[PDB]
């Protein structure tokens with residue numbers, strides 16, 4: 001079994017990459033694609049509170065992302081890992097660290113303490129970081145629409161946040177150059193994963 | 201002016217909601233409510249071809265919905281927006297994306313390329329998504345199903361969820377699992393809040 005998380009800002013090609021990697025890995029492995037809350041009832045109820053919130057306090061929001069993370073981990077991820085599955089998870093702890101911790105300014109160490117209470121030692125076996133520059137990311141976000149200064153600044157802070165998290169911690173982390181055309185990003189991600197799965 | 205579209209599967213209370221919301225807004229706004237083809241002659245002739253179709257190829261069907269969309273947009277919507285009106289439109293691009301693109305399996309990106317040729321940059325200012333769960337939706341449809349109908353209804357909802365997930369900025373999701381009185385109220389409030397910001 002393997003617990004593989006995918007991290008990156010919007011515009012990193014993360015959705016395309018997970019889907020294409022899934023379609024290739026399924027040939028050889030019993031693989032599932034998931035994201036939080038991922039259909040888990042309590043997590044779905046938490047997701048409704050977050051989405052229906054009117055100017056919700058950022059710490060309450062962080063605690064709800066963490067509660068949805070736990071429910072998804074306990075009721076979906078852990079049972080799949082027990083069945084010997086390869087679990088491809090779109091966003092995990094590092095998303096809370098980059099978004100709530102860094103970009104929203106709660107503090108990375110504070111959001112880490114919160115999320116370590118939530119995951120209780122269950123860190124990913126491997127984390128794919130889709131390393132996109134703000135500029136390439138911006139262009140992909142514009143393309144995927146129909147950006148204002150606040151959106152551009154928030155996108156930059158998320159990227160700065162991811163750079164800081166990787167700078168301080170890098171073992172499970174494997175950074176893929178997401179500035180490349182998506183065909184190459186998919187190939188490098190697939191190769192990185194196969195290399196890991198073949199080391200058992 | 202404002203171009204407001206309404207989207208959702210059957211069983212979302214969309215007909216009731218748009219009709220009741222239009223009845224309220226018509227007291228305080230220069231607003232019109234329409235749907236495709238909306239009486240536009242070319243659109244009406246296209247509608248007859250779609251409705252009289254015997255196992256029509258899904259891509260032909262998508263092109264006819266997009267041709268009806270253009271005629272209605274050009275002859276009805278654009279002139280009203282030029283007069284400074286609020287235009288309430290029941291189903292637009294997102295219906296083609298969810299039904300032809302996702303549920304029928306042509307592909308969302310392919311149906312989007314087709315519809316972007318049809319709308320030529322005229323995306324809605326605001327799209328109200330009547331967010332109903334498959335289960336509540338099913339019950340409303342029965343009140344107003346075989347395995348194929350149930351599966352198609354679920355796919356349409358999955359389709360809408362995917363479109364909103366990838367393009368969340370344009371949409372305002374209203375909880376359509378609520379009694380229709382509350383769905384109408386939340387939609388009305390969402391619209392008035394938007395119109396008062398510009």
Ligand SMILES: CCNc1cc([C@@H](c2ccccc2)N2CCC[C@H](n3cc(C)c(=O)[nH]c3=O)C2)cc(Oc2cccc(Cl)c2)c1C(=O)O
Nearest residue numbers: 036037046047050064065068091092095096099100365368
């Ligand atoms: C366009 C995608 N649609 C959605 C968009 C968002 C959005 C957001 C942030 C704050 C407040 C409201 C909405 N935002 C988008 C980039 C990544 C970000 N994000 C993710 C993770 C995993 C995290 O830990 N921290 C964090 O900031 C979540 C939140 C969403 O709902 C969730 C998701 C997971 C769990 C729950 Cl409880 C609720 C959804 C959704 O429709 O599922």
Ligand SMILES: CCNc1cc([C@@H](c2ccccc2)N2CCC[C@H](n3cc(C)c(=O)[nH]c3=O)C2)cc(Oc2cccc(Cl)c2)c1C(=O)O
Nearest residue numbers: 236237243246247250251264265268291292295296299300
């Ligand atoms: C009982 C409701 N009556 C009607 C029901 C339908 C029906 C359908 C689908 C496929 C084949 C045959 C009938 N279906 C109902 C759910 C939404 C769906 N739908 C909508 C839009 C806007 C889209 O883009 N794609 C899509 O799948 C249309 C099509 C209709 O005719 C139209 C409407 C707009 C334009 C034209 Cl050309 C023709 C009508 C009608 O009486 O007007």
